[PDB]
Amino acid sequence: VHLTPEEKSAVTALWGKVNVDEVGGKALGRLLVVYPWTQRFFESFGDLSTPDAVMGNPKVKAHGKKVLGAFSDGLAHLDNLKGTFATLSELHCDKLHVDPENFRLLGNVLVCVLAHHFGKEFTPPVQAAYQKVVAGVANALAHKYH
Amino acid sequence: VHLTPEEKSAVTALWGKVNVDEVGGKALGRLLVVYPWTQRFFESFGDLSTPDAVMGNPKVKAHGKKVLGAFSDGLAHLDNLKGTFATLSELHCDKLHVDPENFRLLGNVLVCVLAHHFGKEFTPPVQAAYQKVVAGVANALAHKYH
Amino acid sequence: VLSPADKTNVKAAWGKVGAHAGEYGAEALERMFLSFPTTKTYFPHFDLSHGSAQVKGHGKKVADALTNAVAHVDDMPNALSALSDLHAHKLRVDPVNFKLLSHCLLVTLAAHLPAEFTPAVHASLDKFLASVSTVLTSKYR
Amino acid sequence: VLSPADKTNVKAAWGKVGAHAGEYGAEALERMFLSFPTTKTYFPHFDLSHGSAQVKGHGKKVADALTNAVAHVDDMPNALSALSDLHAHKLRVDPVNFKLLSHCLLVTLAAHLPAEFTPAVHASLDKFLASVSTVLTSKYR
Numbered sequence: 001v002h003l004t005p006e007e008k009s010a011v012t013a014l015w016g017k018v019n020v021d022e023v024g025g026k027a028l029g030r031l032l033v034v035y036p037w038t039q040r041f042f043e044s045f046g047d048l049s050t051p052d053a054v055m056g057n058p059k060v061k062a063h064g065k066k067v068l069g070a071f072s073d074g075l076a077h078l079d080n081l082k083g084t085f086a087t088l089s090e091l092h093c094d095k096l097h098v099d100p101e102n103f104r105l106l107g108n109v110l111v112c113v114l115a116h117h118f119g120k121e122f123t124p125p126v127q128a129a130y131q132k133v134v135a136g137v138a139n140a141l142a143h144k145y146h
Numbered sequence: 147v148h149l150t151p152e153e154k155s156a157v158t159a160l161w162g163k164v165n166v167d168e169v170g171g172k173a174l175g176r177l178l179v180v181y182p183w184t185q186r187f188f189e190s191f192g193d194l195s196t197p198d199a200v201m202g203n204p205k206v207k208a209h210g211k212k213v214l215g216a217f218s219d220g221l222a223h224l225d226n227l228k229g230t231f232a233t234l235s236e237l238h239c240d241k242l243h244v245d246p247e248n249f250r251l252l253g254n255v256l257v258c259v260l261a262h263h264f265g266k267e268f269t270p271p272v273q274a275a276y277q278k279v280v281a282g283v284a285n286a287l288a289h290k291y292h
Numbered sequence: 293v294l295s296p297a298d299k300t301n302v303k304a305a306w307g308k309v310g311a312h313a314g315e316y317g318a319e320a321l322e323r324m325f326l327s328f329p330t331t332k333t334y335f336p337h338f339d340l341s342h343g344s345a346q347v348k349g350h351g352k353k354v355a356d357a358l359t360n361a362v363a364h365v366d367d368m369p370n371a372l373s374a375l376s377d378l379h380a381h382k383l384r385v386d387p388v389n390f391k392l393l394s395h396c397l398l399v400t401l402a403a404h405l406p407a408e409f410t411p412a413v414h415a416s417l418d419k420f421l422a423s424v425s426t427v428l429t430s431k432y433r
Numbered sequence: 434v435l436s437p438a439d440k441t442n443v444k445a446a447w448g449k450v451g452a453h454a455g456e457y458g459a460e461a462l463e464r465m466f467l468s469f470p471t472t473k474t475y476f477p478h479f480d481l482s483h484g485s486a487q488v489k490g491h492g493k494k495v496a497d498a499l500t501n502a503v504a505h506v507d508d509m510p511n512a513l514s515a516l517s518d519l520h521a522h523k524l525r526v527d528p529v530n531f532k533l534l535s536h537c538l539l540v541t542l543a544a545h546l547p548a549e550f551t552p553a554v555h556a557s558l559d560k561f562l563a564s565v566s567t568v569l570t571s572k573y574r
């Protein structure tokens with residue numbers, strides 16, 4: 001993903017202030033609320049019946065964590081996204097059957113959450129860098145689909 | 147992009163049958179008829195106010211043959227579509243100010259025209275190959291946007 | 293909105309499809325699974341191989357929905373109502389996939405309609421399939 | 434469409450935008466231009482430099498149209514009719530770009546309205562902007 005050196009810098013600096021169960025949990029939870037069809041993967045969770053329900057779900061939170069952890073490690077490999085996500089891309093296609101469009105939606109929600117959480121600090125140039133990151137991650141997770 | 151032997155073979159073979167000149171006019175004409183907002187770029191071609199006007203316009207045919215001619219030239223470089231279309235890419239960004247979404251629309255219309263012209267010979271598998279090619283060309287012509 | 297020329301072109305086109313609607317449905321589905329492998333994520337239970345009777349039967353149903361909609365072009369949200377619920381409330385296919393199916397239906401119609409699939413008819417059929425796609429996703433949230 | 438609840442949420446949130454209309458519009462436009470450079474293709478006739486008067490003025494008009502939309506939420510296609518004519522007949526911006534500006538508008542609102550931007554409110558605003566985008570593209574073809 002063609003980030004500039006300073007864009008990489010911006011992403012990392014900002015990412016240092018993120019707690020993830022909180023942030024991962026927040027991004028996944030808002031995905032399920034704003035785009036509720038993504039819950040299709042979530043019959044198991046029972047109450048996802050309201051926004052407060054989704055956001056407080058310990059299940060959602062633990063999965064947010066798992067998802068952003070993977071996403072966090074990709075920041076260490078920004079020149080190797082297809083590589084670092086390949087066997088993960090295969091899992092999501094072969095076993096989990098998740099339409100890659102869901103990755104794009106999560107990415108936009110992750111951006112919205114980051115803006116909400118950091119406020120003015122989430123400047124237009126910072127956002128643009130993160131938009132490349134979330135696009136690169138989605139594209140890497142989609143790459144082994146067949 | 148990446149095509150299987152089956153796919154490259156279908157692309158080459160079908161295109162041997164393609165009168166690029168005729169297919170160009172038809173594809174550009176259809177783009178302007180089907181997605182009429184694309185006419186915003188062709189104001190100097192004159193009258194484009196009905197399907198019959200667009201499809202009978204000689205500047206539309208002329209330009210179609212230039213577009214598809216450049217597309218054709220690209221089929222001989224399927225493994226470095228970016229390097230092959232970089233110049234054109236720059237032209238379309240910096241001089242012509244053409245939103246790359248237009249390229250996706252033309253690929254989808256080009257696919258419809260090959261289907262229409264070739265009928266049953268444009269099999270699902272041949273389509274799949276062309277879909278990979280047109281999405282490649284489009285990402286290539288979008289690549290130098292900034 | 294679908295214009296009266298659109299509705300005319302759609303009825304003329306679908307009228308020419310005739311008893312092959314069902315067949316063109318499955319073909320549209322095969323084209324979609326091959327051209328756009330991500331759509332296969334919604335059919336993990338189906339054998340999606342060429343010739344699959346599951347694909348053929350599902351194609352018949354899709355083609356049949358499109359038939360009712362033509363039959364009732366002036367009030368498509370009614371004709372299709374039962375069906376938008378099903379997608380909005382159960383199947384939960386992301387909206388982006390409807391454009392992919394639509395494109396593949398258009399390619400199938402083009403491949404079988406040498407005379408009928410004029411630019412004007414192509415234009416009307418694309419608007420019709422977008423309209424169907426909009427009805428089918430209208431209750432999604 | 435928009436439920437009574439989405440209408441309530443939109444009015445409440447946009448109400449807090451208040452006199453920051455131009456600032457938030459201009460900000461959203463700037464977010465769009467940096468995040469999605471292809472959108473600059475529609476504004477080659479602007480100085481898109483940071484701070485430019487052209488971006489600030491257009492920001493204002495975009496936000497004022499949205500205040501118009503919020504204020505006539507029970508009748509947006511009429512309220513928006515002139516603007517839908519304009520994008521359909523003249524500007525002719527490809528519909529995909531409306532998703533990109535709507536996203537940047539959500540981001541701007543998130544960054545500025547920490548209290549108001551709950552998950553429920555985020556959802557109603559996303560639906561509202563999609564509705565706006567639909568009316569603005571309804572006459573395209």
Ligand code: HEM
Nearest residue numbers: 038041066067068070071088092096098102103106137141
């Ligand atoms: C931001 C992009 C994403 C990343 C980096 C990511 C990462 C991961 C990782 C590391 C796992 C570990 C799975 C395991 O072996 O237990 C996982 C599992 C899983 N993912 Fe993704 N994920 C992403 C997006 C999504 C989205 C948007 C959805 C659905 C809307 C989804 C659905 C799932 C499911 C259903 C599992 C299995 C969970 C379980 O069985 O406990 N993923 N993901």
Ligand code: HEM
Nearest residue numbers: 184187188209212213216217234242244248249252284287
């Ligand atoms: C996607 C494949 C396309 C290819 C390969 C392509 C190629 C070309 C070529 C070869 C030229 C002639 C310029 C030159 O080198 O002298 C051209 C010009 C141009 N292109 Fe594209 N084109 C593509 C799609 C599009 C689309 C979809 C649009 C807009 C809807 C567009 C808008 C234009 C315009 C407005 C001109 C200038 C025409 C004039 O001379 O007035 N192109 N392109």
Ligand code: HEM
Nearest residue numbers: 331334335350353354357358383385389390393394424425
């Ligand atoms: C032109 C747009 C579409 C139409 C008209 C349509 C129509 C239908 C119909 C008629 C059924 C069966 C209803 C019944 O059982 O009574 C159905 C089911 C289904 N549709 Fe859609 N559909 C469309 C788009 C899509 C798309 C794009 C996808 C996914 C890519 C999709 C995925 C499904 C699935 C997974 C089922 C259930 C199939 C099964 O397991 O039997 N549909 N649809």
Ligand code: HEM
Nearest residue numbers: 472475476491494495498499516524526530531534565566
């Ligand atoms: C929320 C969606 C949008 C709203 C509310 C909106 C509103 C407006 C308004 C109020 C104007 C000024 C018209 C006048 O002079 O009376 C305008 C013009 C314009 N809009 Fe839109 N618009 C939207 C989406 C878009 C998008 C997505 C694009 C392209 C990325 C775009 C491109 C333009 C352009 C190029 C102009 C003319 C600018 C000028 O030269 O002054 N619009 N829009």
